[PDB]
Ligand binder design. Structure first.
Ligand SMILES: CC(C)[C@@H](NC(=O)[C@H](CS)NC(=O)CCC[C@H](N)C(=O)O)C(=O)O
Ligand SMILES: [Fe+3]
Length: 328
Protein backbone atom coordinates (compact mmCIF):
# COMPACT_ATOMS: atom_id res chain seq x y z
CA UNK A 1 0.00 0.00 0.00
CA UNK A 2 1.53 3.28 -1.15
CA UNK A 3 1.05 6.71 0.39
CA UNK A 4 -1.02 9.51 -1.09
CA UNK A 5 0.58 12.84 -1.84
CA UNK A 6 -1.27 15.15 0.54
CA UNK A 7 0.37 18.58 0.57
CA UNK A 8 0.32 20.87 3.59
CA UNK A 9 -1.01 24.19 2.30
CA UNK A 10 -0.60 27.31 4.43
CA UNK A 11 -4.07 28.80 4.04
CA UNK A 12 -3.45 31.91 6.14
CA UNK A 13 -3.34 34.27 3.09
CA UNK A 14 -6.99 33.42 2.42
CA UNK A 15 -7.85 35.43 5.55
CA UNK A 16 -5.98 38.48 4.29
CA UNK A 17 -5.95 41.09 1.53
CA UNK A 18 -2.78 40.07 -0.34
CA UNK A 19 -4.43 39.02 -3.59
CA UNK A 20 -1.28 37.61 -5.18
CA UNK A 21 -0.58 35.50 -2.09
CA UNK A 22 -4.16 34.23 -2.25
CA UNK A 23 -3.57 33.23 -5.89
CA UNK A 24 -0.47 31.27 -4.81
CA UNK A 25 -2.64 29.38 -2.28
CA UNK A 26 -5.25 28.82 -4.98
CA UNK A 27 -2.60 27.32 -7.27
CA UNK A 28 -1.77 24.78 -4.55
CA UNK A 29 -5.47 23.97 -4.07
CA UNK A 30 -5.82 23.49 -7.82
CA UNK A 31 -2.80 21.20 -7.95
CA UNK A 32 -4.01 19.08 -5.04
CA UNK A 33 -7.58 18.95 -6.37
CA UNK A 34 -6.30 17.65 -9.71
CA UNK A 35 -4.01 15.03 -8.12
CA UNK A 36 -5.27 12.85 -5.24
CA UNK A 37 -7.93 15.38 -4.26
CA UNK A 38 -6.79 15.89 -0.66
CA UNK A 39 -4.66 18.46 1.12
CA UNK A 40 -4.04 19.56 4.68
CA UNK A 41 -4.90 23.16 5.49
CA UNK A 42 -2.29 24.42 7.95
CA UNK A 43 -1.86 27.75 9.73
CA UNK A 44 -5.66 27.87 9.87
CA UNK A 45 -6.16 29.67 13.19
CA UNK A 46 -8.53 27.19 14.90
CA UNK A 47 -7.64 25.92 18.35
CA UNK A 48 -7.79 22.20 17.62
CA UNK A 49 -6.34 21.26 21.00
CA UNK A 50 -9.50 22.60 22.68
CA UNK A 51 -11.69 20.97 20.03
CA UNK A 52 -10.22 17.54 20.80
CA UNK A 53 -10.33 18.08 24.57
CA UNK A 54 -13.95 19.22 24.71
CA UNK A 55 -15.02 16.44 22.32
CA UNK A 56 -13.27 13.77 24.36
CA UNK A 57 -14.86 15.01 27.58
CA UNK A 58 -18.30 14.60 25.98
CA UNK A 59 -17.83 11.17 24.46
CA UNK A 60 -16.29 9.79 27.65
CA UNK A 61 -19.01 11.01 30.04
CA UNK A 62 -22.37 10.64 28.23
CA UNK A 63 -24.44 7.77 29.64
CA UNK A 64 -26.75 5.27 27.91
CA UNK A 65 -29.79 7.12 29.27
CA UNK A 66 -28.61 10.38 27.72
CA UNK A 67 -27.87 8.63 24.41
CA UNK A 68 -31.43 7.32 24.12
CA UNK A 69 -32.75 10.78 25.02
CA UNK A 70 -30.73 12.37 22.19
CA UNK A 71 -30.87 9.52 19.69
CA UNK A 72 -31.74 10.01 16.04
CA UNK A 73 -34.86 8.33 14.60
CA UNK A 74 -32.81 5.34 13.42
CA UNK A 75 -32.25 4.41 17.07
CA UNK A 76 -35.34 5.91 18.73
CA UNK A 77 -38.75 5.79 17.03
CA UNK A 78 -40.00 8.56 19.34
CA UNK A 79 -37.81 11.10 17.55
CA UNK A 80 -39.30 11.23 14.05
CA UNK A 81 -37.89 14.70 13.37
CA UNK A 82 -34.26 13.65 14.05
CA UNK A 83 -33.05 12.42 10.70
CA UNK A 84 -29.70 14.26 10.92
CA UNK A 85 -29.12 15.81 14.33
CA UNK A 86 -28.58 13.90 17.55
CA UNK A 87 -26.75 10.88 18.91
CA UNK A 88 -25.79 7.86 16.76
CA UNK A 89 -25.46 4.92 19.13
CA UNK A 90 -22.90 2.15 19.12
CA UNK A 91 -24.12 -1.45 19.35
CA UNK A 92 -21.71 -3.41 21.60
CA UNK A 93 -20.74 -6.64 19.89
CA UNK A 94 -21.85 -5.34 16.46
CA UNK A 95 -21.04 -1.67 15.83
CA UNK A 96 -18.12 0.21 17.34
CA UNK A 97 -18.54 3.76 16.04
CA UNK A 98 -20.79 6.30 17.74
CA UNK A 99 -21.23 9.98 17.09
CA UNK A 100 -23.16 13.20 17.72
CA UNK A 101 -24.27 15.36 14.79
CA UNK A 102 -25.44 18.96 14.94
CA UNK A 103 -26.54 21.51 12.38
CA UNK A 104 -26.76 25.28 11.95
CA UNK A 105 -27.49 26.72 15.42
CA UNK A 106 -29.73 29.33 13.72
CA UNK A 107 -32.26 26.56 12.93
CA UNK A 108 -34.74 27.32 15.72
CA UNK A 109 -38.54 27.04 15.88
CA UNK A 110 -38.53 30.66 14.64
CA UNK A 111 -36.74 29.75 11.46
CA UNK A 112 -38.77 29.88 8.22
CA UNK A 113 -37.32 26.57 6.98
CA UNK A 114 -38.31 24.87 10.24
CA UNK A 115 -41.79 26.41 10.16
CA UNK A 116 -42.12 25.27 6.53
CA UNK A 117 -40.89 21.76 7.44
CA UNK A 118 -38.41 21.77 4.59
CA UNK A 119 -36.44 18.51 4.52
CA UNK A 120 -32.85 18.44 5.87
CA UNK A 121 -33.57 21.27 8.35
CA UNK A 122 -33.82 20.33 12.03
CA UNK A 123 -33.53 22.01 15.41
CA UNK A 124 -30.43 20.72 17.22
CA UNK A 125 -30.82 18.57 20.32
CA UNK A 126 -28.43 18.97 23.25
CA UNK A 127 -27.59 17.12 26.47
CA UNK A 128 -28.30 18.49 29.92
CA UNK A 129 -26.09 21.51 30.61
CA UNK A 130 -25.34 20.49 34.20
CA UNK A 131 -24.30 17.01 33.05
CA UNK A 132 -22.09 18.47 30.29
CA UNK A 133 -21.12 21.97 31.40
CA UNK A 134 -19.97 24.17 28.55
CA UNK A 135 -20.50 21.55 25.86
CA UNK A 136 -23.25 23.28 23.89
CA UNK A 137 -21.41 26.61 24.03
CA UNK A 138 -18.19 24.95 22.86
CA UNK A 139 -19.96 23.11 20.05
CA UNK A 140 -21.83 26.17 18.74
CA UNK A 141 -18.67 28.29 18.92
CA UNK A 142 -16.81 25.57 17.03
CA UNK A 143 -19.50 25.51 14.32
CA UNK A 144 -18.88 29.20 13.59
CA UNK A 145 -15.09 28.88 13.93
CA UNK A 146 -14.99 26.13 11.31
CA UNK A 147 -17.56 28.00 9.24
CA UNK A 148 -15.09 30.85 9.09
CA UNK A 149 -12.23 28.63 8.01
CA UNK A 150 -14.49 27.01 5.44
CA UNK A 151 -15.50 30.36 3.96
CA UNK A 152 -11.82 31.19 3.51
CA UNK A 153 -11.14 27.81 1.89
CA UNK A 154 -14.03 28.40 -0.51
CA UNK A 155 -12.39 31.65 -1.64
CA UNK A 156 -9.30 29.59 -2.46
CA UNK A 157 -11.32 27.05 -4.44
CA UNK A 158 -13.07 29.82 -6.35
CA UNK A 159 -9.81 31.52 -7.32
CA UNK A 160 -8.30 28.13 -8.18
CA UNK A 161 -11.08 27.63 -10.73
CA UNK A 162 -10.63 31.04 -12.37
CA UNK A 163 -13.61 32.64 -10.64
CA UNK A 164 -14.01 35.62 -8.36
CA UNK A 165 -13.33 34.72 -4.75
CA UNK A 166 -17.00 34.83 -3.64
CA UNK A 167 -18.22 32.36 -6.29
CA UNK A 168 -18.90 29.64 -3.70
CA UNK A 169 -18.80 31.61 -0.44
CA UNK A 170 -21.68 33.87 -1.45
CA UNK A 171 -23.99 30.83 -1.14
CA UNK A 172 -22.47 29.81 2.24
CA UNK A 173 -24.30 31.92 4.79
CA UNK A 174 -25.03 31.66 8.51
CA UNK A 175 -28.78 32.16 8.10
CA UNK A 176 -29.36 29.12 5.88
CA UNK A 177 -26.33 26.84 5.66
CA UNK A 178 -27.10 23.13 5.78
CA UNK A 179 -23.57 22.43 6.99
CA UNK A 180 -23.11 19.92 9.78
CA UNK A 181 -20.55 18.97 12.39
CA UNK A 182 -20.19 15.33 13.43
CA UNK A 183 -18.26 14.42 16.61
CA UNK A 184 -17.32 10.78 15.93
CA UNK A 185 -15.74 8.40 18.45
CA UNK A 186 -13.98 5.33 17.13
CA UNK A 187 -13.18 3.21 20.19
CA UNK A 188 -10.50 0.79 21.18
CA UNK A 189 -12.14 -2.59 21.78
CA UNK A 190 -10.62 -5.88 22.93
CA UNK A 191 -12.06 -8.11 21.56
CA UNK A 192 -13.10 -6.01 18.55
CA UNK A 193 -16.56 -6.95 17.16
CA UNK A 194 -16.17 -8.76 13.83
CA UNK A 195 -19.51 -7.39 12.63
CA UNK A 196 -18.03 -3.88 12.88
CA UNK A 197 -15.21 -4.78 10.45
CA UNK A 198 -15.96 -4.90 6.74
CA UNK A 199 -13.71 -6.62 4.20
CA UNK A 200 -13.09 -4.65 1.03
CA UNK A 201 -12.79 -6.24 -2.40
CA UNK A 202 -9.00 -5.86 -2.12
CA UNK A 203 -8.98 -7.61 1.27
CA UNK A 204 -8.46 -4.51 3.40
CA UNK A 205 -10.31 -4.43 6.72
CA UNK A 206 -12.48 -1.34 6.90
CA UNK A 207 -14.60 0.62 9.32
CA UNK A 208 -16.41 2.57 6.55
CA UNK A 209 -16.55 1.56 2.88
CA UNK A 210 -15.69 3.52 -0.25
CA UNK A 211 -17.79 6.57 -1.06
CA UNK A 212 -17.71 10.04 -2.49
CA UNK A 213 -18.40 12.74 0.05
CA UNK A 214 -21.84 14.41 0.12
CA UNK A 215 -20.68 18.03 0.40
CA UNK A 216 -19.30 20.93 -1.55
CA UNK A 217 -16.08 20.44 0.39
CA UNK A 218 -15.29 18.48 3.55
CA UNK A 219 -13.24 20.12 6.33
CA UNK A 220 -12.07 17.36 8.64
CA UNK A 221 -10.09 17.20 11.86
CA UNK A 222 -8.94 13.81 13.10
CA UNK A 223 -6.78 12.71 16.01
CA UNK A 224 -3.32 11.36 15.17
CA UNK A 225 -4.15 7.82 14.07
CA UNK A 226 -3.80 7.00 10.39
CA UNK A 227 -7.01 5.60 8.96
CA UNK A 228 -8.12 7.23 5.70
CA UNK A 229 -7.39 6.02 2.19
CA UNK A 230 -8.06 7.61 -1.20
CA UNK A 231 -8.58 5.66 -4.40
CA UNK A 232 -6.35 6.21 -7.41
CA UNK A 233 -6.08 4.34 -10.71
CA UNK A 234 -3.14 2.49 -9.11
CA UNK A 235 -5.26 1.52 -6.09
CA UNK A 236 -5.93 2.86 -2.64
CA UNK A 237 -3.25 5.04 -1.04
CA UNK A 238 -2.87 5.85 2.64
CA UNK A 239 -3.59 9.43 3.74
CA UNK A 240 -1.18 10.30 6.53
CA UNK A 241 -2.57 11.67 9.76
CA UNK A 242 -1.83 15.25 10.87
CA UNK A 243 -3.60 16.20 14.11
CA UNK A 244 -2.58 19.86 13.67
CA UNK A 245 -4.16 20.40 10.23
CA UNK A 246 -7.55 20.06 8.62
CA UNK A 247 -7.90 17.46 5.86
CA UNK A 248 -9.74 19.07 2.94
CA UNK A 249 -11.33 17.49 -0.13
CA UNK A 250 -14.13 18.13 -2.62
CA UNK A 251 -17.53 16.48 -2.41
CA UNK A 252 -19.74 15.34 -5.25
CA UNK A 253 -21.51 18.71 -5.54
CA UNK A 254 -18.17 20.28 -6.56
CA UNK A 255 -17.54 17.46 -9.03
CA UNK A 256 -20.94 18.09 -10.62
CA UNK A 257 -20.56 21.84 -11.03
CA UNK A 258 -16.99 21.68 -12.35
CA UNK A 259 -17.86 19.04 -14.98
CA UNK A 260 -15.71 16.60 -12.95
CA UNK A 261 -12.63 18.84 -13.32
CA UNK A 262 -12.34 18.72 -9.51
CA UNK A 263 -13.39 15.16 -8.82
CA UNK A 264 -14.89 14.04 -5.55
CA UNK A 265 -12.17 11.59 -4.47
CA UNK A 266 -13.36 8.14 -3.52
CA UNK A 267 -12.22 7.46 0.04
CA UNK A 268 -12.66 4.86 2.78
CA UNK A 269 -11.80 4.35 6.45
CA UNK A 270 -9.47 1.50 7.38
CA UNK A 271 -10.19 -0.50 10.49
CA UNK A 272 -7.71 0.38 13.23
CA UNK A 273 -8.09 -0.87 16.79
CA UNK A 274 -7.32 2.43 18.51
CA UNK A 275 -9.22 5.12 20.39
CA UNK A 276 -9.57 8.07 18.05
CA UNK A 277 -11.69 11.05 17.07
CA UNK A 278 -13.02 12.05 13.66
CA UNK A 279 -14.66 15.48 13.49
CA UNK A 280 -15.89 16.43 10.00
CA UNK A 281 -17.53 19.68 9.03
CA UNK A 282 -19.53 19.15 5.86
CA UNK A 283 -19.61 22.39 3.90
CA UNK A 284 -23.18 22.43 2.57
CA UNK A 285 -24.89 25.46 1.01
CA UNK A 286 -28.47 26.58 1.51
CA UNK A 287 -31.48 24.50 0.56
CA UNK A 288 -32.21 26.58 -2.55
CA UNK A 289 -28.57 27.31 -3.51
CA UNK A 290 -27.88 26.60 -7.18
CA UNK A 291 -24.40 26.98 -8.67
CA UNK A 292 -24.34 27.10 -12.47
CA UNK A 293 -21.98 24.41 -13.83
CA UNK A 294 -18.97 25.25 -15.96
CA UNK A 295 -16.12 23.33 -17.58
CA UNK A 296 -12.66 24.81 -16.91
CA UNK A 297 -11.23 22.46 -19.56
CA UNK A 298 -13.10 24.14 -22.39
CA UNK A 299 -11.97 27.41 -24.00
CA UNK A 300 -15.50 28.82 -23.61
CA UNK A 301 -16.04 27.28 -20.16
CA UNK A 302 -19.49 26.02 -21.09
CA UNK A 303 -21.05 22.95 -19.48
CA UNK A 304 -24.24 21.17 -20.56
CA UNK A 305 -24.89 19.90 -17.01
CA UNK A 306 -28.07 20.86 -15.19
CA UNK A 307 -27.76 23.34 -12.31
CA UNK A 308 -28.50 21.29 -9.21
CA UNK A 309 -30.37 22.61 -6.17
CA UNK A 310 -28.27 21.94 -3.08
CA UNK A 311 -31.12 20.84 -0.85
CA UNK A 312 -32.35 18.13 -3.21
CA UNK A 313 -28.73 17.03 -3.73
CA UNK A 314 -28.17 16.75 0.02
CA UNK A 315 -31.40 14.91 0.81
CA UNK A 316 -30.70 12.30 -1.86
CA UNK A 317 -26.99 12.04 -1.09
CA UNK A 318 -27.45 11.40 2.62
CA UNK A 319 -30.16 8.77 2.04
CA UNK A 320 -28.11 7.05 -0.65
CA UNK A 321 -24.99 7.01 1.52
CA UNK A 322 -26.94 5.29 4.33
CA UNK A 323 -28.32 2.78 1.85
CA UNK A 324 -24.89 1.99 0.40
CA UNK A 325 -22.59 2.09 3.44
CA UNK A 326 -25.00 1.56 6.34
CA UNK A 327 -26.60 3.60 9.09
CA UNK A 328 -23.77 5.04 11.17
C1 LIG B 1 -14.16 10.02 6.98
C2 LIG B 1 -14.85 10.92 8.01
C3 LIG B 1 -15.38 12.18 7.34
C4 LIG B 1 -15.99 10.17 8.73
N1 LIG B 1 -17.02 9.72 7.80
C5 LIG B 1 -18.17 10.39 7.67
O1 LIG B 1 -18.48 11.34 8.38
C6 LIG B 1 -19.11 9.90 6.57
C7 LIG B 1 -18.33 9.77 5.27
S1 LIG B 1 -17.85 11.38 4.59
N2 LIG B 1 -20.22 10.83 6.39
C8 LIG B 1 -21.49 10.50 6.62
O2 LIG B 1 -21.81 9.40 7.06
C9 LIG B 1 -22.50 11.58 6.35
C10 LIG B 1 -23.00 12.24 7.65
C11 LIG B 1 -23.96 13.40 7.36
C12 LIG B 1 -24.55 13.96 8.69
N3 LIG B 1 -25.29 12.96 9.50
C13 LIG B 1 -25.53 15.09 8.36
O3 LIG B 1 -26.71 15.00 8.64
O4 LIG B 1 -25.00 16.09 7.74
C14 LIG B 1 -15.42 8.99 9.50
O5 LIG B 1 -14.45 9.13 10.21
O6 LIG B 1 -16.06 7.85 9.35
FE1 LIG C 1 -16.01 10.84 3.22
Amino acid sequence: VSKANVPKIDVSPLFGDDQAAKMRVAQQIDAASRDTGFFYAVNHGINVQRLSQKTKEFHMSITPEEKWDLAIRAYNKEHQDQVRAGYYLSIPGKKAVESFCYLNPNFTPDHPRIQAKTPTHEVNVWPDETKHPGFQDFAEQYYWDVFGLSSALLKGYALALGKEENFFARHFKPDDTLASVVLIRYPYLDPYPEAAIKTAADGTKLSFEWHEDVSLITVLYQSNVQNLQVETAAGYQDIEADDTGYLINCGSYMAHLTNNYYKAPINRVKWVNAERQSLPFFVNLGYDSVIDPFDPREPNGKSDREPLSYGDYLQNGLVSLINKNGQT
